[PDB]
Structures are given as structure tokens and as C-alpha cells.
Amino acid sequence: VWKDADTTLFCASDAKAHETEVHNVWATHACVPTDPNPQEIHLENVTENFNMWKNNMVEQMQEDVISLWDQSLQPCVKLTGGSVIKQACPKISFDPIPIHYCTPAGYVILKCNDKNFNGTGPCKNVSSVQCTHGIKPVVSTQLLLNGSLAEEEIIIRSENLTNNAKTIIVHLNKSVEINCTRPSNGDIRKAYCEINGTKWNKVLKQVTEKLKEHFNNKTIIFQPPSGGDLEITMHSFNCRGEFFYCNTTQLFNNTCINGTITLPCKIKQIINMWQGTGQAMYAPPIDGKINCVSNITGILLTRDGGANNTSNETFRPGGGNIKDNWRSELYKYKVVQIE
Ligand SMILES: CC1(C)CC(NC(=O)C(=O)Nc2ccc(Br)cc2)CC(C)(C)N1
Ligand SMILES: *[C@@H]1O[C@H](CO)[C@@H](O)[C@H](O)[C@H]1NC(C)=O
Ligand SMILES: *[C@@H]1O[C@H](CO)[C@@H](O)[C@H](O)[C@H]1NC(C)=O
Ligand SMILES: *[C@@H]1O[C@H](CO)[C@@H](O)[C@H](O)[C@H]1NC(C)=O
Ligand SMILES: *[C@@H]1O[C@H](CO)[C@@H](O)[C@H](O)[C@H]1NC(C)=O
Ligand SMILES: *[C@@H]1O[C@H](CO)[C@@H](O)[C@H](O)[C@H]1NC(C)=O
Ligand SMILES: *[C@@H]1O[C@H](CO)[C@@H](O)[C@H](O)[C@H]1NC(C)=O
Ligand SMILES: *[C@@H]1O[C@H](CO)[C@@H](O)[C@H](O)[C@H]1NC(C)=O
Ligand SMILES: *[C@@H]1O[C@H](CO)[C@@H](O)[C@H](O)[C@H]1NC(C)=O
Ligand SMILES: *[C@@H]1O[C@H](CO)[C@@H](O)[C@H](O)[C@H]1NC(C)=O
Ligand SMILES: *[C@@H]1O[C@H](CO)[C@@H](O)[C@H](O)[C@H]1NC(C)=O
Ligand SMILES: *[C@@H]1O[C@H](CO)[C@@H](O)[C@H](O)[C@H]1NC(C)=O
């Protein structure tokens, strides 16, 4: 017998003690080795309720990633609360590694194995584990990168679809690669992302059809962000320590519903912190080819309000709350206390 409960989790990873890469360093001192032979118990015809939108596991992963960035990516100048903090800001080795989240004695993690599970409600196929799967703490907006894929159909996730103020997480069942490069050798900050147009438009059409099922077959329209900070209006992410801001206008235009899609990007030194603090400024980009090839595995969407009297629903890429990023991976888990 058990019950829903919150407790302090610990982490496990396969980090290398000899790596200077910041994630490896953090996990080496903050986590333990992973279990080579993990045990999993499938509960016989047990029904459990989940709520990915109210899961303390999310808050804890957030806290880990905040501390990791706080120790690994200190900017030259921090602007928060009115005070100005200056300090050294050397370039680092940066490449996210999988982090496992595990429960201590007296506790266990319940895992929903239901196909097409949306993250909330009852789960029929439930198993118990000590640790989650390996989750890379990838920080980004608009597009979710290097995450897990839905096993069956594309899944739409939201705490409340009817509430347009609540973020929508689209969980893809097929990866679309995004190839971002800052070429070696008139602007060290100019960059670009290449994406297979055929693959993207096909997936996006599948997402459209999926959104129809949730919005009474209303017409689904995609549009670029209306306004807001650059971190939100553009696809923001960190590649090799450098902050990339990419213009995704070409991705979200309800027209191509063929060739290569080249998104214009730029590396920014001055960033609005996702931690919520304030503003941070980093040193200029390192020289040479700066390249990151990522899997697009999900999308963060915000729905336009004031469309109730029309046959259209408008969706725009969003994000900014990194907790949603962790939710996209932790949705199927919950902690319970055993006796
Ligand atoms: C809640 C709300 C509206 C979200 C905002 N988000 C961000 O500034 C953000 O996500 N920035 C960011 C930075 C680097 C990378 Br790489 C990706 C994204 C920041 C705060 C202060 C928390 N307000
Ligand atoms: C329940 O989930 C487990 C783990 O994914 C899977 O092996 C099993 O086939 C599922 N059971 C059914 C009947 O769907
Ligand atoms: C998830 O599935 C449950 C099944 O009862 C349902 O109540 C809930 O509305 C679903 N959530 C979404 C966003 O589809
Ligand atoms: C992805 O999900 C959609 C439904 O959302 C489905 O039609 C399609 O077959 C899936 N693709 C793959 C490769 O499973
Ligand atoms: C979902 O959002 C709608 C629109 O804001 C609201 O009227 C409704 O109460 C919400 N549903 C729940 C279960 O809170
Ligand atoms: C990229 O996506 C493919 C599946 O489309 C997967 O096999 C591979 O592991 C992914 N790479 C990651 C997760 O970094
Ligand atoms: C990514 O794009 C760059 C520049 O076009 C290219 O050199 C590289 O081969 C690409 N990588 C992959 C895996 O497609
Ligand atoms: C969408 O249209 C199809 C085809 O007529 C219908 O079967 C289905 O019930 C509709 N779905 C919604 C959510 O309105
Ligand atoms: C993206 O590029 C388009 C032109 O292709 C431009 O109109 C738009 O302002 C850009 N978006 C942002 C957020 O800068
Ligand atoms: C969508 O693409 C078409 C291409 O002809 C363009 O004219 C239109 O302005 C685009 N809408 C946007 C970028 O919102
Ligand atoms: C995208 O993939 C398809 C095969 O799925 C291929 O035919 C097409 O050439 C690719 N497009 C690009 C831009 O490479
Ligand atoms: C995604 O994973 C690939 C393979 O490990 C990596 O090269 C790339 O830098 C990752 N993308 C991001 C945004 O971290």
C-alpha cells in the first residue's frame, strides 16, 4: 500500500570524472552512478491518477538545473534586483548529459505506461521504479530538443486547453533534425539553422490534424509570436555554451500544408535569464565552427484568445517557463510513499 507524497530526490548519471564538460563535472559531485540492472515492477491491474502539471519532481529538476547553470555558466555581468554583479566569465565545455531522478528508501516512483497518455487522469498500465529514464536538462524555448518521443500518436498536453493562458506541449512521435551552425570564417554572431522542409511540414500537418481532435475540428492556424522578449519570440537554446536565437517564422506559416529551410540565427551575449533573476551578459563567441545538430521532439504553443466566435484557432510558438521543458519528460512519473 502507498500514497501520493513528496520527498527529496537524488540523481544518478554516467558522468565522467575526468571530463571538464560542465554537466559531467556537476553530476560527478552531485549524483551517484546509475544502476546497470534497474528493477521494474508492473502493477497488476492497478489504476493510478497522475497530474504532470502538479508534480514536485518538476520543481526539483528545475532546482538542479538552476544550481548547475549557477555553477557552470556565470556571466561577466549580472543585473538583478538593481544591484550589479561583475565577475570572470571564461568559455566552458558545454554538452548536456542524461540525468536520472531517483527516490530514497520508503519511497518509489510510479510510472505510467499507457500509450497516448496525456499526462493527467487515470493510468491503466502502471509500473514502479527507483529511477526515471535519463533526462538531458536541455534549456530552450519554442522547440523541445533532444527529448524523448511519444511511442504512438502525437500527444497534446495542457493543464487546461480551454484556458489559452496555459501553455500547450506538443509531443512528437517522430524526430525532425535541426542543424544549427555558426560558420568559422563579417559577423561572428550571424548563424543559421537548416531543417528538412519535407519532414517538418509533414509533421506539422500531423500536429494540425491532432489539434483538430481537441478543438472540435476547428481550423488550425499557425502564426509567429505576436510580441514579447526575444527569448520567447525566437527559438532560444544553448549550443556549446553559446546562446542561439533563431527566427522560426519560416517554420510556422500555414502555407506549406519542400526544400531545405534555413532559419536566420544570431548568438547573443546579453540574455534574459530563464532562472527569473534578471539579465546576464557573456563574452563573445569562440572562434571556429560552432555546430549543434538536435532532434526536435516537441513544441511549445500558446493559443490566441478571442476566437470563440470564429471557426479558427491560432497557435504560436512559445515557452519561457523552463519547468514546462522538464514536464515534457517527467509527465509519466509520480512519487509515492510506501509502508
Ligand atoms: C515567467 C517568465 C515570463 C519567463 C521568462 N523566461 C526567460 O527569460 C527565458 O526562458 N530565458 C531563456 C534564456 C536562455 C535560454 Br538558452 C532560453 C531561455 C523569465 C521570467 C523572469 C521567469 N518570467
Ligand atoms: C504495459 O507497459 C509495459 C511497459 O511498457 C508493456 O511492456 C506492456 O506491454 C504494457 N501492457 C499492455 C497490455 O499494454
Ligand atoms: C487526459 O485523459 C484524461 C482521461 O480521463 C482526460 O480526463 C483529460 O481531459 C485528458 N487531458 C487532455 C489534455 O487531453
Ligand atoms: C505519429 O502520430 C500520428 C497521430 O498523431 C500518427 O498518425 C502517425 O502514424 C505517427 N507516426 C509514427 C511514425 O508513428
Ligand atoms: C479551464 O479553462 C477555462 C477557461 O478559462 C475555465 O473556464 C475552466 O474553469 C477551466 N477548467 C478547469 C477544470 O479549471
Ligand atoms: C535523435 O533522434 C533519433 C530518433 O529520431 C534518436 O534515435 C537519437 O537517439 C536522437 N538523438 C539524441 C536523443 O540526441
Ligand atoms: C549540418 O549542416 C552543416 C552545414 O550545412 C553541414 O556541414 C553538416 O554536414 C550538417 N550535419 C548533418 C548531420 O546534417
Ligand atoms: C471531426 O470530423 C470527423 C469527420 O466527420 C468526425 O468523425 C469527428 O467526430 C470530428 N471531430 C471533432 C472533435 O469534432
Ligand atoms: C523573423 O523574420 C521575419 C522576416 O522573415 C521578420 O519579419 C520578423 O520580424 C522576424 N522575427 C523576429 C522575432 O525578429
Ligand atoms: C507566410 O508566407 C507567405 C509566403 O508568400 C508570406 O507572404 C506571408 O507574409 C507569411 N506570413 C507570415 C510570415 O506570417
Ligand atoms: C527530407 O527528407 C526526404 C525523405 O524523407 C528527402 O526526400 C528530402 O530530400 C529531404 N529534404 C532535405 C531538405 O534534405
Ligand atoms: C542534441 O544532441 C546532440 C547529440 O548529442 C548534440 O550534438 C546537440 O548539441 C544537442 N543539442 C542541444 C541543443 O543540446
Coordinates of C-alpha atoms and ligand atoms in Angstrom, one line a residue:
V1 CA 0.0 0.0 0.0
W2 CA 1.1 3.5 -0.8
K3 CA 0.1 7.2 -1.1
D4 CA 1.0 10.3 -3.1
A5 CA 3.9 12.1 -1.4
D6 CA 6.8 14.5 -1.9
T7 CA 10.3 13.8 -0.8
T8 CA 13.8 14.9 -1.6
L9 CA 15.0 13.0 -4.7
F10 CA 18.6 12.2 -5.6
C11 CA 20.2 11.9 -9.0
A12 CA 22.2 9.2 -10.9
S13 CA 24.3 9.5 -14.1
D14 CA 27.2 8.1 -16.1
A15 CA 29.2 11.3 -15.9
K16 CA 33.0 11.1 -16.4
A17 CA 35.2 12.3 -13.5
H18 CA 37.9 13.3 -16.0
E19 CA 35.7 15.5 -18.2
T20 CA 35.8 19.3 -18.0
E21 CA 32.4 19.5 -19.6
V22 CA 30.2 21.3 -17.0
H23 CA 27.4 18.7 -16.9
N24 CA 29.8 15.9 -16.2
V25 CA 31.5 18.0 -13.5
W26 CA 28.2 18.8 -11.8
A27 CA 26.9 15.3 -11.9
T28 CA 30.2 13.9 -10.7
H29 CA 29.9 15.9 -7.5
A30 CA 26.1 15.9 -7.2
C31 CA 24.9 12.5 -8.4
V32 CA 25.7 8.8 -8.0
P33 CA 26.5 6.0 -10.6
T34 CA 23.5 4.7 -12.5
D35 CA 22.1 1.2 -11.8
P36 CA 23.2 -1.2 -14.6
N37 CA 20.4 -3.7 -13.7
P38 CA 17.4 -1.5 -12.7
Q39 CA 14.4 -3.2 -11.3
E40 CA 10.9 -2.6 -12.5
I41 CA 7.6 -3.9 -11.2
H42 CA 4.5 -3.8 -13.3
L43 CA 1.4 -3.4 -11.0
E44 CA -1.3 -5.9 -11.7
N45 CA -4.5 -4.1 -12.9
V46 CA -3.8 -1.0 -10.7
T47 CA -5.3 2.4 -11.5
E48 CA -3.3 5.5 -10.6
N49 CA -4.1 9.2 -11.2
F50 CA -1.4 11.5 -12.5
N51 CA -1.0 15.2 -12.8
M52 CA 2.1 16.3 -14.8
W53 CA 1.1 19.9 -14.1
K54 CA 1.3 19.5 -10.3
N55 CA 4.4 17.3 -9.9
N56 CA 7.1 18.2 -7.3
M57 CA 9.6 16.2 -9.4
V58 CA 9.5 19.1 -11.8
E59 CA 10.4 21.7 -9.2
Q60 CA 13.3 19.6 -8.1
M61 CA 14.8 19.1 -11.5
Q62 CA 14.4 22.9 -12.0
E63 CA 16.4 23.4 -8.9
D64 CA 19.2 21.1 -10.0
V65 CA 19.5 22.8 -13.4
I66 CA 19.5 26.2 -11.8
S67 CA 22.3 25.2 -9.5
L68 CA 24.2 23.6 -12.4
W69 CA 23.9 26.7 -14.5
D70 CA 24.7 28.9 -11.5
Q71 CA 28.0 27.0 -11.0
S72 CA 28.8 26.4 -14.7
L73 CA 27.6 29.5 -16.6
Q74 CA 28.4 32.6 -14.6
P75 CA 28.2 35.7 -16.8
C76 CA 30.6 38.6 -16.9
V77 CA 27.9 40.9 -15.5
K78 CA 24.6 40.0 -13.8
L79 CA 21.8 42.5 -13.5
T80 CA 19.3 41.5 -10.8
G81 CA 17.3 43.4 -8.1
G82 CA 19.0 46.7 -9.1
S83 CA 22.5 45.6 -8.0
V84 CA 25.2 44.9 -10.5
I85 CA 27.4 41.8 -10.1
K86 CA 30.7 41.6 -12.1
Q87 CA 32.9 38.5 -12.3
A88 CA 35.1 36.3 -14.5
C89 CA 33.3 34.7 -17.4
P90 CA 35.6 32.1 -19.1
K91 CA 34.4 30.0 -22.0
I92 CA 33.4 26.4 -21.0
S93 CA 32.8 23.0 -22.3
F94 CA 29.0 22.5 -22.6
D95 CA 27.0 19.5 -23.7
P96 CA 24.0 18.2 -21.6
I97 CA 24.1 14.6 -20.4
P98 CA 21.2 12.4 -19.2
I99 CA 20.3 12.8 -15.6
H100 CA 18.3 10.2 -13.7
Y101 CA 15.9 11.1 -10.8
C102 CA 15.5 8.5 -8.1
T103 CA 13.6 8.0 -4.8
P104 CA 15.1 7.2 -1.5
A105 CA 14.1 4.3 0.9
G106 CA 10.5 4.2 1.9
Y107 CA 9.5 5.8 -1.5
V108 CA 9.1 4.6 -5.1
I109 CA 8.4 6.2 -8.4
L110 CA 5.2 5.2 -10.2
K111 CA 5.4 5.2 -14.0
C112 CA 2.5 5.4 -16.4
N113 CA 3.0 3.1 -19.4
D114 CA -0.3 3.9 -21.0
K115 CA 0.0 4.6 -24.8
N116 CA -1.0 8.1 -25.7
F117 CA -1.1 9.1 -22.0
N118 CA -1.7 12.9 -21.9
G119 CA -0.1 13.4 -18.5
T120 CA -3.3 13.8 -16.4
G121 CA -6.0 11.5 -15.2
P122 CA -6.1 7.7 -14.5
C123 CA -3.4 5.3 -15.8
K124 CA -4.2 1.7 -16.5
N125 CA -0.7 0.4 -17.2
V126 CA 1.4 1.3 -14.2
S127 CA 4.8 0.1 -13.1
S128 CA 7.1 1.0 -10.1
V129 CA 10.7 2.0 -10.5
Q130 CA 13.5 3.6 -8.4
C131 CA 14.7 6.0 -11.1
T132 CA 13.3 7.8 -14.1
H133 CA 14.9 7.4 -17.5
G134 CA 17.9 9.6 -18.4
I135 CA 16.8 13.1 -18.9
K136 CA 19.0 15.7 -20.6
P137 CA 18.4 19.2 -19.0
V138 CA 18.1 20.9 -22.3
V139 CA 17.1 24.5 -21.9
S140 CA 15.1 26.1 -24.8
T141 CA 12.1 27.9 -26.0
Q142 CA 9.6 27.2 -28.8
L143 CA 11.1 23.8 -29.7
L144 CA 11.9 21.0 -27.4
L145 CA 15.3 19.4 -28.3
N146 CA 16.9 16.0 -27.7
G147 CA 14.0 14.8 -25.7
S148 CA 12.0 11.6 -25.7
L149 CA 9.5 10.8 -28.4
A150 CA 5.9 9.7 -27.9
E151 CA 5.7 6.0 -28.7
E152 CA 2.4 6.0 -30.6
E153 CA 0.4 9.0 -31.8
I154 CA 1.4 12.7 -31.4
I155 CA 0.2 13.8 -27.9
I156 CA -1.2 17.2 -27.0
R157 CA -0.6 18.2 -23.4
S158 CA -2.1 21.1 -21.4
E159 CA -3.3 21.7 -17.8
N160 CA -6.4 23.1 -19.4
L161 CA -6.8 23.5 -23.2
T162 CA -9.9 25.7 -22.7
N163 CA -7.6 28.2 -20.9
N164 CA -5.5 29.9 -23.6
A165 CA -3.2 31.2 -20.9
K166 CA -2.0 27.7 -20.2
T167 CA 1.0 26.5 -22.3
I168 CA 0.5 23.6 -24.7
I169 CA 3.1 20.9 -25.1
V170 CA 3.1 19.0 -28.3
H171 CA 4.8 15.6 -28.0
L172 CA 6.1 14.4 -31.4
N173 CA 6.2 10.7 -32.3
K174 CA 8.9 11.3 -34.9
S175 CA 12.1 13.4 -34.7
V176 CA 12.8 16.3 -37.1
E177 CA 16.5 17.3 -37.1
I178 CA 17.5 20.9 -36.8
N179 CA 21.0 21.7 -38.0
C180 CA 22.5 24.9 -36.4
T181 CA 25.8 26.4 -37.4
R182 CA 27.9 29.5 -36.8
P183 CA 30.5 29.2 -39.7
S184 CA 34.2 29.7 -38.9
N185 CA 35.2 32.4 -41.4
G186 CA 31.8 39.7 -41.4
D187 CA 29.7 38.9 -38.4
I188 CA 30.9 36.4 -35.7
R189 CA 27.3 36.4 -34.3
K190 CA 25.4 35.5 -37.5
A191 CA 24.3 31.9 -37.7
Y192 CA 21.6 29.7 -39.2
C193 CA 19.6 26.5 -38.7
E194 CA 18.8 24.1 -41.5
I195 CA 15.7 21.9 -41.4
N196 CA 14.3 19.4 -43.9
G197 CA 11.2 21.2 -45.2
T198 CA 9.5 17.9 -46.3
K199 CA 9.8 16.3 -42.9
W200 CA 8.8 19.5 -40.9
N201 CA 5.7 20.3 -43.0
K202 CA 4.6 16.7 -42.8
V203 CA 5.0 16.5 -39.1
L204 CA 3.4 19.9 -38.6
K205 CA 0.4 18.8 -40.7
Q206 CA 0.1 15.8 -38.4
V207 CA 0.1 18.2 -35.4
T208 CA -2.6 20.2 -37.1
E209 CA -4.8 17.1 -37.5
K210 CA -4.2 16.2 -33.9
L211 CA -5.1 19.6 -32.6
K212 CA -8.4 19.3 -34.5
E213 CA -9.3 16.3 -32.4
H214 CA -9.0 18.6 -29.3
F215 CA -10.7 21.6 -30.8
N216 CA -13.9 20.2 -32.3
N217 CA -12.5 20.1 -35.9
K218 CA -11.9 23.9 -35.9
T219 CA -9.5 25.2 -38.5
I220 CA -5.9 25.2 -37.1
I221 CA -3.7 28.1 -37.9
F222 CA 0.0 28.7 -37.1
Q223 CA 1.5 32.1 -36.7
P224 CA 4.7 33.7 -35.5
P225 CA 4.8 35.1 -31.9
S226 CA 2.8 38.4 -31.6
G227 CA 5.4 40.1 -29.3
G228 CA 7.4 39.7 -26.1
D229 CA 11.1 39.2 -25.3
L230 CA 13.5 37.7 -27.8
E231 CA 13.9 34.5 -25.7
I232 CA 10.2 33.8 -26.4
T233 CA 9.6 35.3 -29.9
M234 CA 12.6 33.3 -31.2
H235 CA 13.8 29.7 -30.7
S236 CA 16.3 30.2 -27.9
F237 CA 18.8 27.5 -26.9
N238 CA 22.4 27.0 -25.8
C239 CA 24.8 25.3 -28.2
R240 CA 28.4 24.6 -27.0
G241 CA 28.0 27.3 -24.4
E242 CA 26.7 29.9 -26.9
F243 CA 23.2 31.3 -26.7
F244 CA 21.4 30.9 -30.1
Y245 CA 18.4 32.9 -31.0
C246 CA 16.7 31.7 -34.2
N247 CA 13.9 33.2 -36.2
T248 CA 11.3 30.5 -36.6
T249 CA 8.9 32.5 -38.9
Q250 CA 9.6 30.1 -41.7
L251 CA 8.6 27.1 -39.6
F252 CA 5.2 28.4 -38.6
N253 CA 3.4 29.7 -41.7
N254 CA 0.2 27.8 -42.7
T255 CA 1.1 27.7 -46.4
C256 CA 3.2 24.6 -46.9
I257 CA 0.4 22.4 -45.6
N258 CA 9.7 21.2 -49.8
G259 CA 13.4 22.1 -49.9
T260 CA 15.7 23.0 -47.0
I261 CA 14.5 25.6 -44.5
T262 CA 17.3 27.9 -43.5
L263 CA 16.4 29.9 -40.3
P264 CA 18.4 33.1 -39.6
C265 CA 20.1 33.0 -36.2
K266 CA 22.3 35.2 -34.0
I267 CA 24.4 34.5 -31.0
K268 CA 23.6 36.9 -28.2
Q269 CA 25.8 37.9 -25.3
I270 CA 23.1 39.7 -23.3
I271 CA 20.4 37.3 -22.1
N272 CA 17.2 37.4 -20.1
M273 CA 17.7 34.7 -17.5
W274 CA 15.3 31.8 -17.5
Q275 CA 16.1 31.4 -13.8
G276 CA 13.9 34.5 -13.3
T277 CA 16.7 36.6 -11.8
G278 CA 17.4 39.4 -14.3
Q279 CA 19.8 39.9 -17.2
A280 CA 23.2 38.3 -17.9
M281 CA 26.0 39.2 -20.3
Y282 CA 28.5 36.6 -21.6
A283 CA 31.7 37.0 -23.6
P284 CA 31.7 36.9 -27.4
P285 CA 31.5 33.6 -29.3
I286 CA 34.6 31.3 -29.5
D287 CA 36.2 31.1 -32.9
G288 CA 35.9 28.2 -35.4
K289 CA 32.8 26.2 -36.4
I290 CA 30.0 26.3 -33.8
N291 CA 27.6 23.5 -34.7
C292 CA 24.8 21.6 -32.9
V293 CA 22.5 19.0 -34.6
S294 CA 19.5 18.4 -32.5
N295 CA 16.3 16.4 -32.5
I296 CA 13.1 18.4 -32.4
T297 CA 10.9 16.1 -30.2
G298 CA 8.2 18.6 -29.1
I299 CA 6.8 22.0 -29.5
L300 CA 5.6 24.7 -27.0
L301 CA 2.5 26.5 -28.2
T302 CA 0.3 29.3 -26.9
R303 CA -3.2 29.7 -28.3
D304 CA -4.8 33.0 -29.3
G305 CA -7.7 34.2 -27.3
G306 CA -10.9 35.8 -28.7
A307 CA -11.5 33.2 -31.4
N308 CA -14.7 31.6 -29.9
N309 CA -17.0 33.2 -32.5
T310 CA -14.8 32.0 -35.4
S311 CA -14.0 28.7 -37.0
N312 CA -10.3 29.3 -36.5
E313 CA -7.9 28.6 -33.7
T314 CA -4.5 30.3 -33.9
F315 CA -1.4 28.8 -32.4
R316 CA 2.0 30.5 -31.9
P317 CA 5.4 29.1 -30.7
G318 CA 6.0 30.0 -27.1
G319 CA 7.8 29.0 -23.9
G320 CA 9.9 30.8 -21.3
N321 CA 8.9 28.6 -18.3
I322 CA 11.7 26.0 -18.3
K323 CA 9.6 23.9 -15.9
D324 CA 7.5 23.0 -18.9
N325 CA 10.6 21.6 -20.5
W326 CA 11.1 19.2 -17.6
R327 CA 7.3 18.4 -17.5
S328 CA 7.6 17.2 -21.1
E329 CA 9.9 14.4 -19.8
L330 CA 8.6 13.8 -16.3
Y331 CA 4.9 13.7 -17.2
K332 CA 4.6 9.9 -16.8
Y333 CA 6.2 9.8 -13.3
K334 CA 5.0 10.5 -9.7
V335 CA 6.4 9.8 -6.3
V336 CA 4.6 7.7 -3.7
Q337 CA 5.4 6.7 -0.1
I338 CA 5.4 3.0 0.8
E339 CA 4.7 1.2 4.1
Ligands
LIG1 C1 7.9 33.6 -16.2 C2 8.7 34.5 -17.2 C3 7.6 35.2 -18.1 C4 9.6 33.6 -18.2 C5 10.9 34.3 -18.6 N1 11.8 33.4 -19.4 C6 13.0 33.7 -19.8 O1 13.6 34.8 -19.6 C7 13.8 32.5 -20.5 O2 13.3 31.5 -20.7 N2 15.1 32.9 -21.0 C8 16.0 31.9 -21.7 C9 17.4 32.1 -21.5 C10 18.3 31.2 -22.1 C11 17.8 30.2 -22.9 BR1 19.0 29.0 -23.8 C12 16.4 30.0 -23.1 C13 15.5 30.9 -22.5 C14 11.7 34.8 -17.4 C15 10.8 35.0 -16.1 C16 11.5 36.1 -15.3 C17 10.8 33.8 -15.2 N3 9.5 35.5 -16.5
LIG2 C1 2.3 -2.1 -20.1 O1 3.5 -1.4 -20.2 C2 4.6 -2.3 -20.4 C3 5.9 -1.4 -20.4 O2 5.9 -0.5 -21.5 C4 4.5 -3.0 -21.7 O3 5.6 -3.9 -21.8 C5 3.2 -3.8 -21.7 O4 3.0 -4.4 -23.0 C6 2.0 -2.9 -21.4 N1 0.8 -3.7 -21.2 C7 -0.2 -3.7 -22.0 C8 -1.1 -4.9 -22.0 O5 -0.4 -2.8 -22.8
LIG3 C1 -6.2 13.1 -20.5 O1 -7.0 12.0 -20.3 C2 -8.0 12.1 -19.3 C3 -8.8 10.8 -19.2 O2 -9.8 10.9 -18.3 C4 -8.9 13.2 -19.5 O3 -9.8 13.4 -18.4 C5 -8.2 14.5 -19.8 O4 -9.1 15.5 -20.2 C6 -7.1 14.3 -20.8 N1 -6.3 15.5 -21.0 C7 -6.1 16.1 -22.2 C8 -5.4 17.4 -22.2 O5 -6.4 15.5 -23.2
LIG4 C1 2.5 10.0 -35.3 O1 1.3 10.2 -34.7 C2 0.2 10.4 -35.7 C3 -1.1 10.7 -34.9 O2 -0.9 11.8 -34.1 C4 0.1 9.1 -36.5 O3 -0.9 9.3 -37.5 C5 1.4 8.7 -37.1 O4 1.2 7.4 -37.7 C6 2.5 8.7 -36.1 N1 3.8 8.5 -36.8 C7 4.6 7.4 -36.5 C8 5.9 7.3 -37.2 O5 4.3 6.6 -35.6
LIG5 C1 -10.3 25.7 -18.0 O1 -10.2 27.0 -18.5 C2 -11.5 27.6 -18.8 C3 -11.3 28.9 -19.5 O2 -10.5 29.8 -18.7 C4 -12.2 27.7 -17.4 O3 -13.5 28.3 -17.7 C5 -12.3 26.4 -16.8 O4 -12.8 26.6 -15.4 C6 -11.0 25.6 -16.7 N1 -11.3 24.3 -16.3 C7 -10.9 23.8 -15.1 C8 -11.1 22.3 -14.8 O5 -10.4 24.5 -14.2
LIG6 C1 17.8 11.8 -32.4 O1 16.5 11.2 -32.7 C2 16.6 9.8 -33.1 C3 15.3 9.3 -33.4 O2 14.7 10.2 -34.4 C4 17.2 9.0 -31.9 O3 17.5 7.7 -32.4 C5 18.5 9.6 -31.4 O4 18.9 9.0 -30.2 C6 18.3 11.1 -31.1 N1 19.5 11.8 -30.6 C7 19.5 12.3 -29.4 C8 18.4 11.9 -28.4 O5 20.4 13.0 -29.0
LIG7 C1 24.8 20.3 -40.6 O1 24.9 21.4 -41.5 C2 26.2 21.7 -41.9 C3 26.2 23.0 -42.7 O2 25.4 22.8 -43.8 C4 26.9 20.6 -42.6 O3 28.2 20.8 -42.8 C5 26.7 19.3 -41.8 O4 27.1 18.2 -42.6 C6 25.3 19.1 -41.3 N1 25.2 18.0 -40.4 C7 24.3 17.0 -40.5 C8 24.4 15.8 -39.6 O5 23.4 17.0 -41.4
LIG8 C1 -14.1 15.7 -37.0 O1 -14.7 15.3 -38.2 C2 -14.7 13.9 -38.3 C3 -15.2 13.5 -39.7 O2 -16.5 14.0 -39.9 C4 -15.7 13.4 -37.2 O3 -15.7 12.0 -37.3 C5 -15.2 13.8 -35.8 O4 -16.1 13.4 -34.9 C6 -14.8 15.2 -35.7 N1 -14.1 15.5 -34.5 C7 -14.4 16.5 -33.7 C8 -13.6 16.6 -32.4 O5 -15.3 17.3 -34.0
LIG9 C1 11.7 36.9 -38.4 O1 11.9 37.2 -39.8 C2 10.9 37.9 -40.4 C3 11.1 38.1 -41.8 O2 11.4 36.8 -42.4 C4 10.6 39.2 -39.7 O3 9.6 39.9 -40.3 C5 10.4 39.0 -38.2 O4 10.3 40.2 -37.5 C6 11.5 38.1 -37.6 N1 11.1 37.8 -36.2 C7 11.7 38.3 -35.2 C8 11.2 37.9 -33.8 O5 12.7 39.1 -35.3
LIG10 C1 3.5 33.3 -44.9 O1 4.3 33.0 -46.1 C2 4.0 33.8 -47.2 C3 4.8 33.4 -48.4 O2 4.3 34.0 -49.6 C4 4.1 35.3 -46.8 O3 3.7 36.1 -47.9 C5 3.4 35.7 -45.6 O4 3.7 37.0 -45.2 C6 3.8 34.7 -44.5 N1 3.1 35.0 -43.2 C7 3.8 35.3 -42.1 C8 5.3 35.3 -42.3 O5 3.3 35.4 -41.0
LIG11 C1 13.9 15.4 -46.4 O1 13.7 14.0 -46.3 C2 13.2 13.5 -47.5 C3 13.0 12.0 -47.3 O2 12.2 11.8 -46.1 C4 14.1 13.7 -48.7 O3 13.5 13.2 -49.9 C5 14.3 15.2 -48.9 O4 15.3 15.4 -49.9 C6 14.8 15.8 -47.6 N1 14.9 17.2 -47.7 C7 16.1 17.9 -47.4 C8 16.0 19.4 -47.3 O5 17.2 17.3 -47.3
LIG12 C1 21.3 17.4 -29.0 O1 22.1 16.2 -29.0 C2 23.2 16.1 -29.9 C3 23.8 14.7 -29.8 O2 24.4 14.5 -28.6 C4 24.2 17.2 -29.6 O3 25.2 17.2 -30.5 C5 23.5 18.6 -29.7 O4 24.4 19.6 -29.3 C6 22.3 18.6 -28.7 N1 21.5 19.8 -28.9 C7 21.4 20.7 -27.9 C8 20.6 21.9 -28.1 O5 21.9 20.5 -26.8

